[PDB]
Amino acid sequence: DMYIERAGDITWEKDAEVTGNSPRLDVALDESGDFSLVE
Amino acid sequence: GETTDGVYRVMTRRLLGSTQVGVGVMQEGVFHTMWHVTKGAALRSGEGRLDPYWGDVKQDLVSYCGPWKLDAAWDGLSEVQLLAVPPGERAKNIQTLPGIFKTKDGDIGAVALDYPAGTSGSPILDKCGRVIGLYGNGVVIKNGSYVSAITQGKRE
Ligand SMILES: O=C(Nc1ccc2c(c1)CNC2)c1cc(Br)cc2ccccc12
């Protein structure tokens, strides 16, 4: 059996870690809810 | 049980030790998470019984104790934050600018951050704090890394 344990508050924190890129990717979604890379 | 509005971990004692299968969002008496995390199975909070209410495998979303409440939307231009709750580590707000997923049913936002599969169901936040979607379902890229869609449900 699964259970939940609180992990914190939902707040936008200023001066936080700004990392990560912004990629435009062509994808397709299937009946099983899975994304696929279409090229 | 504990229905205090906030971000929660989704744990299981079925495997060796306690294993974090995902993350969720408690907002307005409803616990919103990704479908592949629980698979529509009843959860437990302290002693309380959290029973499923709504779900969809294609959307990959599931809501407990009530209908989907989260209805914020990405503006397409602003930087967002991922309240990343990693298995075994403390929650962390990671600010980023999202890219794009180009589909046949329109375009959707995408966060390019590398995280383990146990972090699935973590909220993507805006500058106001509202939950604009869930991190956990996307695609594996040419570099091995993972790019996740900004998955948002539907309010009533
Ligand atoms: O397993 C993952 N995601 C997922 C799995 C099963 C299903 C779905 C999504 C939706 N339809 C069923 C995953 C999540 C994350 Br945050 C990082 C990953 C890194 C590498 C490989 C997979 C993942």
JSON list of N, CA and C and ligand atoms in Angstrom, two decimals, chain A residues 32-34, chain B residues 36 57 60 115-117 119-120 135-138 140 146, ligand 1:
[
{"chain": "A", "resi": 32, "resn": "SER", "atom": "N", "xyz": [-1.40, 5.33, -25.00]},
{"chain": "A", "resi": 32, "resn": "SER", "atom": "CA", "xyz": [-0.92, 4.99, -23.66]},
{"chain": "A", "resi": 32, "resn": "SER", "atom": "C", "xyz": [-0.35, 6.17, -22.86]},
{"chain": "A", "resi": 33, "resn": "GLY", "atom": "N", "xyz": [-0.53, 7.40, -23.35]},
{"chain": "A", "resi": 33, "resn": "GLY", "atom": "CA", "xyz": [-0.05, 8.61, -22.69]},
{"chain": "A", "resi": 33, "resn": "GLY", "atom": "C", "xyz": [1.46, 8.79, -22.69]},
{"chain": "A", "resi": 34, "resn": "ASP", "atom": "N", "xyz": [2.15, 8.22, -23.69]},
{"chain": "A", "resi": 34, "resn": "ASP", "atom": "CA", "xyz": [3.60, 8.32, -23.79]},
{"chain": "A", "resi": 34, "resn": "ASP", "atom": "C", "xyz": [4.03, 9.23, -24.93]},
{"chain": "B", "resi": 36, "resn": "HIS", "atom": "N", "xyz": [1.01, 7.49, -13.95]},
{"chain": "B", "resi": 36, "resn": "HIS", "atom": "CA", "xyz": [2.01, 6.40, -13.84]},
{"chain": "B", "resi": 36, "resn": "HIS", "atom": "C", "xyz": [2.63, 6.22, -12.42]},
{"chain": "B", "resi": 57, "resn": "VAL", "atom": "N", "xyz": [-5.29, 8.21, -18.79]},
{"chain": "B", "resi": 57, "resn": "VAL", "atom": "CA", "xyz": [-3.98, 7.66, -19.12]},
{"chain": "B", "resi": 57, "resn": "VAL", "atom": "C", "xyz": [-3.28, 8.48, -20.19]},
{"chain": "B", "resi": 60, "resn": "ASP", "atom": "N", "xyz": [-2.19, 11.55, -18.54]},
{"chain": "B", "resi": 60, "resn": "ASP", "atom": "CA", "xyz": [-1.32, 11.05, -17.49]},
{"chain": "B", "resi": 60, "resn": "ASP", "atom": "C", "xyz": [-1.55, 11.78, -16.19]},
{"chain": "B", "resi": 115, "resn": "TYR", "atom": "N", "xyz": [16.16, 14.90, -14.08]},
{"chain": "B", "resi": 115, "resn": "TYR", "atom": "CA", "xyz": [15.79, 14.37, -12.78]},
{"chain": "B", "resi": 115, "resn": "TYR", "atom": "C", "xyz": [15.44, 12.89, -12.81]},
{"chain": "B", "resi": 116, "resn": "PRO", "atom": "N", "xyz": [15.58, 12.18, -11.67]},
{"chain": "B", "resi": 116, "resn": "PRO", "atom": "CA", "xyz": [15.20, 10.76, -11.63]},
{"chain": "B", "resi": 116, "resn": "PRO", "atom": "C", "xyz": [13.70, 10.56, -11.79]},
{"chain": "B", "resi": 117, "resn": "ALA", "atom": "N", "xyz": [13.28, 9.35, -12.21]},
{"chain": "B", "resi": 117, "resn": "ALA", "atom": "CA", "xyz": [11.85, 9.03, -12.40]},
{"chain": "B", "resi": 117, "resn": "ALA", "atom": "C", "xyz": [11.01, 9.14, -11.13]},
{"chain": "B", "resi": 119, "resn": "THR", "atom": "N", "xyz": [10.98, 11.63, -9.13]},
{"chain": "B", "resi": 119, "resn": "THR", "atom": "CA", "xyz": [10.60, 13.04, -8.94]},
{"chain": "B", "resi": 119, "resn": "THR", "atom": "C", "xyz": [9.28, 13.38, -9.69]},
{"chain": "B", "resi": 120, "resn": "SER", "atom": "N", "xyz": [8.64, 12.39, -10.35]},
{"chain": "B", "resi": 120, "resn": "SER", "atom": "CA", "xyz": [7.42, 12.53, -11.15]},
{"chain": "B", "resi": 120, "resn": "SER", "atom": "C", "xyz": [6.19, 12.96, -10.36]},
{"chain": "B", "resi": 135, "resn": "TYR", "atom": "N", "xyz": [5.52, 17.84, -13.68]},
{"chain": "B", "resi": 135, "resn": "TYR", "atom": "CA", "xyz": [6.77, 17.34, -14.23]},
{"chain": "B", "resi": 135, "resn": "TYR", "atom": "C", "xyz": [6.80, 15.81, -14.07]},
{"chain": "B", "resi": 136, "resn": "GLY", "atom": "N", "xyz": [7.02, 15.06, -15.14]},
{"chain": "B", "resi": 136, "resn": "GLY", "atom": "CA", "xyz": [7.08, 13.60, -15.05]},
{"chain": "B", "resi": 136, "resn": "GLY", "atom": "C", "xyz": [6.86, 12.85, -16.35]},
{"chain": "B", "resi": 137, "resn": "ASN", "atom": "N", "xyz": [6.24, 13.50, -17.34]},
{"chain": "B", "resi": 137, "resn": "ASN", "atom": "CA", "xyz": [5.96, 12.86, -18.63]},
{"chain": "B", "resi": 137, "resn": "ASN", "atom": "C", "xyz": [6.46, 13.71, -19.79]},
{"chain": "B", "resi": 138, "resn": "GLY", "atom": "N", "xyz": [7.45, 13.18, -20.48]},
{"chain": "B", "resi": 138, "resn": "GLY", "atom": "CA", "xyz": [8.05, 13.84, -21.63]},
{"chain": "B", "resi": 138, "resn": "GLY", "atom": "C", "xyz": [8.76, 12.82, -22.49]},
{"chain": "B", "resi": 140, "resn": "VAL", "atom": "N", "xyz": [12.87, 11.18, -23.90]},
{"chain": "B", "resi": 140, "resn": "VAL", "atom": "CA", "xyz": [14.32, 11.08, -23.75]},
{"chain": "B", "resi": 140, "resn": "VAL", "atom": "C", "xyz": [14.93, 11.66, -25.03]},
{"chain": "B", "resi": 146, "resn": "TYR", "atom": "N", "xyz": [16.40, 14.25, -20.15]},
{"chain": "B", "resi": 146, "resn": "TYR", "atom": "CA", "xyz": [14.95, 14.17, -20.26]},
{"chain": "B", "resi": 146, "resn": "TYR", "atom": "C", "xyz": [14.29, 15.56, -20.35]},
{"chain": "C", "resi": 1, "resn": "LIG", "atom": "O1", "xyz": [9.49, 7.11, -16.29]},
{"chain": "C", "resi": 1, "resn": "LIG", "atom": "C1", "xyz": [9.33, 8.30, -16.52]},
{"chain": "C", "resi": 1, "resn": "LIG", "atom": "N1", "xyz": [8.17, 8.82, -17.01]},
{"chain": "C", "resi": 1, "resn": "LIG", "atom": "C2", "xyz": [7.00, 8.10, -17.38]},
{"chain": "C", "resi": 1, "resn": "LIG", "atom": "C3", "xyz": [6.96, 6.72, -17.18]},
{"chain": "C", "resi": 1, "resn": "LIG", "atom": "C4", "xyz": [5.84, 5.99, -17.53]},
{"chain": "C", "resi": 1, "resn": "LIG", "atom": "C5", "xyz": [4.77, 6.64, -18.13]},
{"chain": "C", "resi": 1, "resn": "LIG", "atom": "C6", "xyz": [4.79, 8.02, -18.31]},
{"chain": "C", "resi": 1, "resn": "LIG", "atom": "C7", "xyz": [5.90, 8.76, -17.95]},
{"chain": "C", "resi": 1, "resn": "LIG", "atom": "C8", "xyz": [3.49, 8.45, -18.93]},
{"chain": "C", "resi": 1, "resn": "LIG", "atom": "N2", "xyz": [2.96, 7.18, -19.44]},
{"chain": "C", "resi": 1, "resn": "LIG", "atom": "C9", "xyz": [3.44, 6.10, -18.56]},
{"chain": "C", "resi": 1, "resn": "LIG", "atom": "C10", "xyz": [10.45, 9.28, -16.30]},
{"chain": "C", "resi": 1, "resn": "LIG", "atom": "C11", "xyz": [10.23, 10.39, -15.52]},
{"chain": "C", "resi": 1, "resn": "LIG", "atom": "C12", "xyz": [11.26, 11.26, -15.21]},
{"chain": "C", "resi": 1, "resn": "LIG", "atom": "BR1", "xyz": [10.91, 12.78, -14.12]},
{"chain": "C", "resi": 1, "resn": "LIG", "atom": "C13", "xyz": [12.52, 11.06, -15.69]},
{"chain": "C", "resi": 1, "resn": "LIG", "atom": "C14", "xyz": [12.80, 9.93, -16.49]},
{"chain": "C", "resi": 1, "resn": "LIG", "atom": "C15", "xyz": [14.10, 9.72, -17.00]},
{"chain": "C", "resi": 1, "resn": "LIG", "atom": "C16", "xyz": [14.38, 8.64, -17.78]},
{"chain": "C", "resi": 1, "resn": "LIG", "atom": "C17", "xyz": [13.36, 7.73, -18.10]},
{"chain": "C", "resi": 1, "resn": "LIG", "atom": "C18", "xyz": [12.09, 7.92, -17.64]},
{"chain": "C", "resi": 1, "resn": "LIG", "atom": "C19", "xyz": [11.76, 9.02, -16.81]}
]
